[PDB]
Symmetry: none
Subunit: 75 residues, 6 copies
């Protein structure tokens, strides 16, 4: 016979205190962008991105992250 007892216990804390968060400046692509193309041949797929793209400002007041995985596998 088999007994498996799976009773992990978590009383854990993940915490931040921040007295103030701010004055955050993100200025991507202030410079002039100039693209000049003549007599180009493309015989397959083209992906083109020009300018200021996909830029992120992410400012969470906590942003604390608990990641936990429990796996019990039996045969």
């Amino acid at each position: 016979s088999v007994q498996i007892v799976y009773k992990p216990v978590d009383l854990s804390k993940v915490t931040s205190k921040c007295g103030s968060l701010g004055n955050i400046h993100h200025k991507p692509g202030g410079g002039q962008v100039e693209v000049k193309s003549e007599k180009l041949d493309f015989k397959d797929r083209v992906q083109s991105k020009i300018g200021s793209l996909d830029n992120i400002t992410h400012v969470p007041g906590g942003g604390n992250k608990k990641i936990e995985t429990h796996k019990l596998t039996f045969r």
Copy 2:
């Protein structure tokens, strides 16, 4: 015979205190963008993005994240 007891316990806390969150400036693509094309040939799909696209400002007052997975697999 088999006994499987799966009784994980979580009393865990994920917390932030932020005294003030703000004055966030995100200014993507302030520069001039100029794209000039002559005599181009394309023989397959073209994707083009020009200017200021897909830029994000994300400012959650907490933004705390508890991610948990429980898997019990039997055969």
Copy 3:
């Protein structure tokens, strides 16, 4: 016969205290960008990015991170 008792206990704390977080300046691509192309042949796929792309300002007031994995595997 078999007994397996799986009872890990976690009372752990992950903590930050920050008195103030701020005055953060990120300015990628303030310089002029100039691309000139003549008489190019492409016989396969082209991916092109020009300017200020994918830049991140990430400023969490905590950003504390607990990662835990529990695996019990039986045969």
Copy 4:
């Protein structure tokens, strides 16, 4: 005879640009105040202030000031 020609000229400018103004916290007198008095004698005027009084939060978006005095005095 007397000629007095008082013709001062002001083309002066007083200016501010502020990109954002905010997240201002003023919390005077969060502490407990306890006053106990026994057998006191006052033979003249009493002024008493107890608690949180006359506190100011003043946040003008400009608050720019021009003060000018012109005085011509003759005898």
Copy 5:
């Protein structure tokens, strides 16, 4: 004879631009106030203020001020 030509000229501008103005918190007197008296004698005027009084929050979008005094005095 006397000529007095009082012709001062002002083209002077006082200006502000504020992109946003807000998130102002003023919390005077959050603490408990306790005042106890026994066997006190007063023989002239008493003025008493207890608690939270005369506190100001003043947040003008401009709040710019131009003060000008002109005084021609003759005898």
Copy 6:
């Protein structure tokens, strides 16, 4: 005879540019205040202030200040 020509010319500028002003915290009198008085005699005027009084948070987005005085005095 007398000629007095009083023609000062002002083209002066007083200017501020501020990218962001904020996350300002003022917390006077967070501590407990305890005042105990027994058997005091006052034979003249009493002024008393106890707690958190006359505290200022002043945050002008410009706060630029031109002060000018013109005086012409004659005899």
